């Protein structure tokens, strides 16, 4: 009666939840994800699952992934690299082994224009470099690491590394970036956005965010311009 609504920028990743209460008992028989632009108009399968084999299809072939453990009645969908064309209604239908069906509220996906992708910081100031996937379901992001590389660099540098299975008291930030890099996102809410505290001329370069939902990685890239005033 009221569609959860989800706004994401072109190119970003969305995770669209679909869980019947997670139990240690697989009751999920089938999982179907349908896409529609409006009503009054045909739908197409993003992805359908049955008997421990999922079929990503259509334009979503390369970009759609069944992320939820279906053996735990979690049939959540992860749509990568969202286009404007993907703007519409997404509907999850799970058929239970007891033969009842569970339809989840269709979710309106509103696709916004492309992120800036070109950041301009002023020396000796703080800036933010944001990176996050958006989902109706929390705590799906299993790992986040930011890699820095000046166009010159035949090399990579860890800006900030944070993982679900950390045997540390905090995120890992190496070298130069120590003491300055800091997390502005709530990774539990699938938000890996970071903050750079006291920017120096040498910080200039390309920052790459690799944000993981299991094995599945989504990658962003931000060019940082530093300026002396």
């Amino acid at each position: 009666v009221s569609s959860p609504q989800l706004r994401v920028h072109v190119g970003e990743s969305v995770l669209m939840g679909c869980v019947v209460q997670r139990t240690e008992e697989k009751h999920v028989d089938r999982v179907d994800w349908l896409f529609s632009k409006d009503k009054d108009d045909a739908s197409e399968y993003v992805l359908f699952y049955y008997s421990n084999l999922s079929v990503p299809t259509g334009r979503f072939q390369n970009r759609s992934h069944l992320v939820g453990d279906t053996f735990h009645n979690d049939g959540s969908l992860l749509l990568q690299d969202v286009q404007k064309a993907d703007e519409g209604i997404y509907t999850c239908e799970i058929r239970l082994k007891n033969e009842s069906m569970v339809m989840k509220k269709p979710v309106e996906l509103w696709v916004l224009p492309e992120e800036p992708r070109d950041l301009r910081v002023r020396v000796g100031d703080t800036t933010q470099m944001r990176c996050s996937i958006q989902s109706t379901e929390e705590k799906r992001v299993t790992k986040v690491n930011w890699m820095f590389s000046s166009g010159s660099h035949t090399e990579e540098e860890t800006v900030l590394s944070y993982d679900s299975n950390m045997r540390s008291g905090k995120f890992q930030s190496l070298g130069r970036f120590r003491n300055r890099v800091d997390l502005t996102g709530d990774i539990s809410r699938n938000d890996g956005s970071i903050k750079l505290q006291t920017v120096k001329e040498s910080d200039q370069g390309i920052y790459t965010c690799s944000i993981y939902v299991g094995k599945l990685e989504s990658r962003k890239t931000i060019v940082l311009h530093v300026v002396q005033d």
Epitope: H72, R167, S168
Partner: antibody
Framework: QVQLKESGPGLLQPSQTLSLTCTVS????????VHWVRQAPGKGLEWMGI???????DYNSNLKSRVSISRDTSKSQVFLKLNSLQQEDTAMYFC??????????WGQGIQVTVSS | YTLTQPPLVSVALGQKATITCSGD??????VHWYQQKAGQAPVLVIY???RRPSGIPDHFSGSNSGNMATLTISKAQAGDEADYYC???????????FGSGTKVTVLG
């Protein structure tokens, strides 16, 4: 319905061996490490050890070599085993999920008296 | 090993309450707070120094500076009357460590 529920004997004599079991429902142990934490009547929370998602284990220095944590992924079951039961092994025993750098989800806990 | 924590902290209804948590170089590592009531399992109320799970009341907030964390219970209710343990990570040994614990009593 993500749940941790512990289970085992409520009463034990000294010099016996405790063995608890924590049943992690709604998820898989293959990608989350589970903690064991206890709380003695008077005192606070004491971390005993962890079994990481990868099956690796670390323990509490004080609890050195009479604590033992293993698991069975097939059952989604994480076990604790305590040796040389003395007094004030008497405590509430909790198993908790390890998310990033904290304990997001906890068990209901289990009271375990060690008495003659 | 335990992080220093005041035994008891009182507070009238609606009053502000502040629970401190001290540790060596505590502010180079995340600190988290748990709530525990009568014969109940602990519940995470604050995590990562300064964040809050949905389901926890807005009037909870945390900070971590000068090697001293502080759980703030603004606008204290009677349902906040509980035991609060901070928690962290010892990077000498490789272990997770809790605080001594604080009993928050709600007066008025």
């Amino acid at each position: 319905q993500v749940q941790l529920k512990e289970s085992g004997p409520g009463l034990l004599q000294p010099s016996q061996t405790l063995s608890l079991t924590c049943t992690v429902s709604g998820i898989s142990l293959s990608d989350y490490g589970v903690h064991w934490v206890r709380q003695a009547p008077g005192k606070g929370l004491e971390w005993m050890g962890i079994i990481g998602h990868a099956g690796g284990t670390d323990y509490n220095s004080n609890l050195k070599s009479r604590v033992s944590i293993s698991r069975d992924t097939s059952k989604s079951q994480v076990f604790l085993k305590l040796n040389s039961l003395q007094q004030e092994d008497t405590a509430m025993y909790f198993c908790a999920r390890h998310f990033y750098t904290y304990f997001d989800v906890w068990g209901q806990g289990i009271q375990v008296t060690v008495s003659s | 090993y335990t992080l220093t924590q005041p035994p008891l902290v009182s507070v009238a209804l609606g009053q502000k309450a502040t629970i401190t948590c001290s540790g060596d170089k505590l502010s180079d590592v995340y600190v988290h707070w748990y709530q525990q009531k009568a014969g109940q399992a602990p519940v995470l109320v604050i995590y990562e120094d300064n964040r809050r799970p949905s389901g926890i009341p807005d009037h909870f907030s945390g900070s971590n500076s000068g090697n001293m964390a502080t759980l703030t219970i603004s606008k204290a209710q009677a349902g906040d009357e509980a035991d609060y343990y901070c928690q962290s990570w010892d990077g000498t040994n490789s272990a997770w460590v809790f605080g001594s614990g604080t009993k928050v009593t709600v007066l008025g």
